[PDB]
Ligand binder design. Structure first.
Ligand code: HEC
Ligand code: HEC
Ligand SMILES: CCC[C@H]1COc2ccsc2C(=N)N1
Ligand SMILES: CCC[C@H]1COc2ccsc2C(=N)N1
Ligand SMILES: [Cl-]
Ligand SMILES: [Cl-]
Ligand SMILES: [Zn+2]
Lengths: 399, 401
């Protein structure tokens, strides 16, 4: 049993949950790879998922429990798979999020709105489902967490897939001169949409159309009514010239390319969303050199000295950009949380989870924010990373 | 299958074939990763043979008569005495590899330029103290810092070891004031009290240099005071925030780890202090802003007149940044060697590139290589890393008391 210690406070504990890890990770006693970004087995996984559920409603070992088990086994034996019950799906989704090692916002895992789109039959339907999801979750600015689950993977049938990595993202157009107008991170998907019949725009913040895929069909292009896509223009509380830079970002962070795994079942298409932690926008999206890379320009405008790295001109500009994002989102009344408030809440989460399950899978490298790391509580907290199921998983691109 | 390491900023890829030769076992298992944990006879001969081979391989004389004789020579020494002795040329080589192999060190581009002082002829605590003072002088060099390490007698069978009780040659005392608080560096409360328990008459300042507690084999630790003219220090001041200087903050110039164990070819050296120079973030961010350290963030944010009422104003980020600026400013001003996290991380990327060509890999601890503030603004954040343990190495050992 792994001993876990917090070095700021000094307290220690023992991750007894780690022992129950479902799948295997990349690390071996020979070398750690924690910093890398990336039939009888169906039944076993399914039986375990059923157990977690009946344990979640304090009905473990009941008649209902045993029948549910026999029913799933009967189904698998006959169709090679089985269908979950509504209550199970809801419970599963929450656990997947609960078990996400890289999500710093898990204090909220119990408040998740689940939309059941398992009856979805076409791309056009997928779109209608997605738009309702976006409307509900955006909720005019007071964001609400939600996930929409589409049909599960099937024996003898293609999968449902959303080609985009997010429900909302800006286009990236490779200019001739090697530069990129828009989000460099989205050049491939931007080109795929064009390849499929979309005439592009030419702005830096063009919301990309959706490339939705129904089983064994080519993907279909859909355009999100702008009315549905809430955005925040970025301004600074005192640096007046910032507003004039014409920057902005969308309110809804919605991952749509991961797979949801519950009791041996896989949902290649189950988009989930919540709200942003300011650093993601202020630091990663706007400052990564391979993203919008605005750090230098901002500094020049801040009339800072960029000749020497030791002046810490970079840290200065980044900090002000993060302030603008926070200021701006609060101004537009759109949910957002800073890295301090978020990390503090996560320390609370670890505590609850210790009492609840005796541990909590966590990825130190992803929990610590991209700036002011040691200024946040999690930086001084040891963590154990392991894979538990239900879970959200990465999967290859459909193309 | 060799691990695939990718840089996400550039997209470049390499394979770490050097990790398959990992000498020690790490904490992780395929069941769970413990990467973030701070503390993770024939066996000797197999470690000595490997070291000797590394050595002859380094002077490109592997497989020569001199090589074979050196192997046979250490085997006989072990058969006869249960241990063996290194030659000066080997000790030097070993200490360097030990630095080169340290996963948590971002200043590794400089590994080949380590100056090794052989104090294996040390006979007492008094001599240790002399060697340490010399090291400090040579290394401090009036502000133009030089990397060095002084190796004291190796651990012996049927005999106690040499040990320097302090975790560092230069540290500030920590006095637990009556009311909970701590005057000085909270981190050195225990070592401070041990110096007192052993006859030290304390001070009452915030930056009181601690005396050294040196241990000779089978001897209670003797106490020694460092000549003030030896301990070079830096008064901290900000370049534009004139009130900073008035906070009377300061830090020493010499970063010297003295409580780690140096291992070479199965041989262990419980005492072998080493030093180089600081990376700004270590002083301004960790030592001065850690809540369990000098924890001065609020006092500064206040003097900066920032709204500390709400976290969302990032007042902590602003205060910290300025403090780091002050550290850099003060050191550059005082002509004391120092490097910021942008340059340090940038050079480390060069080191990764050098090592990939030299050994087909580099053991790196991502969580320690990434600076405490402004992580993703430095190039190491976007670099995947593989962590493993190669020997020679600097290791942690339990406190002598
Ligand atoms: C309640 C608001 C909320 C906040 C704030 C939040 N999350 Fe996450 N989150 C994840 C998963 C899965 C990952 C790992 C994703 C990855 O590697 O990008 C993640 C990762 C993250 C990360 C780090 C990954 C990155 O790209 O930097 C942050 C920060 C984060 N979540 C913040 C599933 C969720 C779900 C699913 C039902 C919900 C709701 C959710 N997350 C809600 C939230
Ligand atoms: C050339 C100047 C130089 C710089 C700058 C430097 N080092 Fe290190 N360094 C280490 C070891 C060993 C560790 C891991 C130590 C630990 O966990 O305390 C380390 C860790 C570090 C760390 C991270 C640990 C922390 O406390 O935050 C930094 C930053 C660092 N070194 C900077 C041995 C060395 C040696 C030994 C011959 C030399 C010389 C050395 N280091 C020279 C340098
Ligand atoms: C660009 C999307 C990354 C996203 C990870 O996933 C979620 C899901 C809900 S909020 C959230 C988040 N803060 N960042
Ligand atoms: C408080 C000392 C930690 C020390 C780690 O060890 C070395 C050794 C030479 S410089 C250096 C350093 N930058 N920090
Ligand atoms: Cl994003
Ligand atoms: Cl220090
Ligand atoms: Zn690991």
């Amino acid at each position: 049993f792994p001993r876990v210690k917090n070095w700021e406070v000094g307290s220690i504990t023992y991750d007894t949950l780690s022992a129950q890890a479902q799948q295997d990770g990349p690390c071996t006693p020979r070398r750690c790879l924690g910093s890398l970004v990336f039939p009888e087995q169906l039944l076993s996984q399914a039986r375990d998922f059923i157990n977690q559920y009946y344990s979640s409603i304090k009905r473990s070992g009941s008649q209902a429990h045993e029948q549910r088990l026999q029913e799933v086994e009967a189904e698998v034996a006959a169709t090679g798979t089985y269908q979950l019950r509504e209550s199970e799906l809801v419970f599963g989704a929450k656990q997947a999020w609960r078990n996400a090692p890289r999500c710093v916002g898990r204090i909220q895992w119990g408040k998740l709105q689940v939309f059941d789109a398992r009856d979805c039959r076409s791309a056009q339907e997928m779109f209608t489902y997605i738009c309702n999801h976006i409307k509900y979750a955006t909720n005019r600015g007071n964001l609400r967490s939600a996930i929409t689950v589409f049909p599960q993977r099937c024996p003898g049938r293609g999968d449902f897939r959303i080609w985009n990595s997010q429900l909302v993202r800006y286009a990236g157009y490779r200019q001739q001169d090697g530069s990129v107008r828009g989000d460099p991170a989205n050049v491939e998907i931007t080109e795929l949409c064009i390849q499929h019949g979309w005439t592009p725009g030419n702005g830096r913040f063009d919301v990309l159309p959706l490339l939705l895929q129904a089983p064994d069909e080519p993907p279909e292009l859909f355009l999100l009514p702008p009315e549905l896509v809430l955005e925040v223009p970025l301004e600074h509380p005192t640096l007046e010239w910032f507003a004039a830079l014409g920057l902005r970002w969308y309110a809804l962070p919605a991952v749509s390319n991961m797979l949801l795994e519950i009791g041996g079942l896989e949902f290649p298409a189950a988009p989930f969303s919540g709200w942003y932690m300011s650093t993601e926008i202020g630091t990663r999206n706007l400052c990564d050199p391979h993203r919008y890379n605005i750090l230098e320009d901002v500094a020049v405008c801040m009339d800072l000295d960029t000749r020497t790295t030791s002046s810490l001109w970079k840290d200065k500009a980044a900090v002000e950009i993060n302030v603008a994002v926070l200021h701006s989102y609060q101004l537009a009344k759109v949910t957002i949380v800073d890295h301090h408030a978020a990390t503090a809440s996560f320390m609370k989460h670890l505590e609850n989870e210790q009492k609840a399950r005796g541990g909590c899978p966590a990825d130190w490298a992803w929990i610590v924010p991209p700036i002011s790391g040691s200024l946040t509580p999690v930086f001084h907290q040891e963590m154990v990373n392991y894979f538990l199921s239900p879970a959200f998983r990465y999967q290859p691109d459909p193309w």
